[PDB]
Amino acid sequence: GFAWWAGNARLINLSGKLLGAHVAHAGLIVFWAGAMTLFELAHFIPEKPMYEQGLILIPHIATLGWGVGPGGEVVDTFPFFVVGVVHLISSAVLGFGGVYHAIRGPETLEEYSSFFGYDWKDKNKMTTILGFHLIVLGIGALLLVAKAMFFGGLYDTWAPGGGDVRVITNPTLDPRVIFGYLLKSPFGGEGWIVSVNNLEDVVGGHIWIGLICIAGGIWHILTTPFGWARRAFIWSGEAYLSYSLGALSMMGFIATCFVWFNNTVYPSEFYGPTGPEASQAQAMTFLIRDQKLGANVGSAQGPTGLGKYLMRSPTGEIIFGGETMRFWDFRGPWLEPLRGPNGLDLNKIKNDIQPWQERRAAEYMTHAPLGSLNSVGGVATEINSVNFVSPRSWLATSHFVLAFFFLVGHLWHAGRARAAAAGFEKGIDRESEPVLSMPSLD
């Protein structure tokens, strides 16, 4: 009994029409991935970094090792085109199947096939569909593995020489490293899974995950829910929808922080420097300049009595001074050469900084992820001129927003599911008001 504004809830128990909704919507996702890439490519200019150009999809492709050389220098734009065209083309096939199943195909499936038809309350059929999709996920995760090891490798920002595409011959299988990440603290200096800083660990984790997903995929095909599971859950289409909104929301917050902190699977060559990275780069820049003028940067006492360029962290490591003392957990390929075991190494600072390192720091400092909604780069008090907002800010903010609403959607549908399963989603029975049969609190 649903309004026009909740009309999609009229598809709960129309399995055939609901298949088309999902496949027509799957087409929309592929369409955008296709058209967007074509759009980004149509506007690409190779002379300019990707992050001066508002690109978010091309950075994902270059990260897999297509179209880029050492440095991130774009070498061949044909793989970007091929990804766009194939995605765009595949969306008509899904579009076609979506409209057919929404409008002309059987409204319901369970009369046409006992295989494709389902009842939400069939706990066995539902876990079987879960199992199928788990294998597909496991397959896909191994695809990334397969690319890294057998079909070209991946862009490795850590490679000696500026970064380069590199085949991964020794994925990390040691479970104490792989599952160690899952128990690292999410706080500073630790970073939970966000701190992964090498492709061996990335590739290895996807071997594990693809195995696990196939493992469980088979599990759920072969099993039915145990009794303790049967009694703790609500078994209904809305209930499963809510469960999933919860997980997507959680995943979305994770991605938000991944693109904001991680400079390995979001290499800075492509995406721009991280907040912390740009902040560290400014300290590098003025250390370099002032040293050239003859300042002794180990010994220069700043206004506060803390070192003007270099101080200690609370655990003693030598770090950049100023406000960026907060960012001392930062690690990047342009900085690690300067680090010894006590932190930044004063003899390397006086002797070993390279032009390429100066250059990187000047660039990242002047490309920090600060920017206005209308794409004026810099602090909010900055004048018009530089048309720049970091891909990391566009990606970080959009996914906080989406993550946030899907948690509302989780609370929205979780609670509705609990109430409709108990029978009071529509309001309170006047003749049987629970509270009027309870004793008064006082």
Partner: protein, 334 residues
Amino acid sequence: ANLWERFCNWVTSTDNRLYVGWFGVIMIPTLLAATICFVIAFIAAPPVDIDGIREPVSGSLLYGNNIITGAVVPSSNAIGLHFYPIWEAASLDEWLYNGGPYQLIIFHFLLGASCYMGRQWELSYRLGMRPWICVAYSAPLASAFAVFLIYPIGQGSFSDGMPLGISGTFNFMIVFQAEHNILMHPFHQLGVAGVFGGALFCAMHGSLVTSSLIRETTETESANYGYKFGQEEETYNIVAAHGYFGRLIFQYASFNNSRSLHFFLAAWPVVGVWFTALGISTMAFNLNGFNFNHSVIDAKGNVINTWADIINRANLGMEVMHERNAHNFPLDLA
């Protein structure tokens, strides 16, 4: 009658003057802990080196503060986003200098407040109610998450989360405008619309119902005694109220359905506060308000100032003065 089943029945009982519930099991301890730490700190904590520059800021009453100026100061910039429980300090004295109380208070409050929201779902289930009062509360809870957690994550430091005091609050919102031009951000503008709108509709609805109370009393008694708790009949005349407000404006701009009207009252401030909490959360990643500094120039290319450029002159004065000893390099990138 088994010992666990009987515990479960007390926890979830609809008969406790205050409902507990499974959510209440986390909430009670974490809120009692955040509360007790806060009360002690506000009164007696020594000064805290918030900005990590060995310049401690006095926040409590016994150190020369009043109700307006006192605060539990945020933890040292030197800590940034590191976890800093008591057991990581060499001593309570260290923990107090570096601002440990703030971390303890905010984490426990965020948790217990999260469980508060869920507790609202829970009791609604146990009483046969509809479930979504908690969706309404998530707008303020999301606001508290943005200024105590999200904003520090994106700026890299809890030293930049909102202080727990009245003047510290204003300090946080002054620096915020200098760094983000938040007044010129459309999500703060929707917050103002949510919040002004909410006060307007509160007064409207309150005055429309009050205007149409049905006569049940004499001049010498409160009109309030015309309603008796649990009476079945409505206590005002909704078509007389719709009759007046339709004519004050025009017919179709006025509700005659009390369900739509009350749903509207809930949706307007909730949605607007979601946005303005999203505004703080996305400005945490420095996607700032509109910047029209020097967007207007003449045929020669002189700058012709607007009100935006005046705003910016004041943002500049906030910028150059805040945390006056803490910056060694020319741009405040965080």
